[PDB]
Symmetry: D2
Amino acid sequence: GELKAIAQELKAIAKELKAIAWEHK
Amino acid sequence: GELKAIAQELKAIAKELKAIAWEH
Amino acid sequence: GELKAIAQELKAIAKELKAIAWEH
Amino acid sequence: GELKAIAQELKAIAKELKAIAWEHK
């Protein structure tokens, strides 16, 4: 449970970092 | 640039944590 | 702003993973 | 071992995100 939830959270963070990278372009 | 590399690393880490979760 | 909030979250996650590592 | 190494890596990532946040200021 916990490690799968953390894994999903890291993917959510990764998606947001790509959004910020684009905003930064 | 670096933010997209960090994002790719975090996706790779997510994959590894799912594997560890099953072990556990 | 958001990058510093994400950094704080990642430090919190790091703390939790250390706890899980001991369990396992 | 592995989860402690990942934890250290997430702290390393967090430090770099703060560096990028500052560069963005």
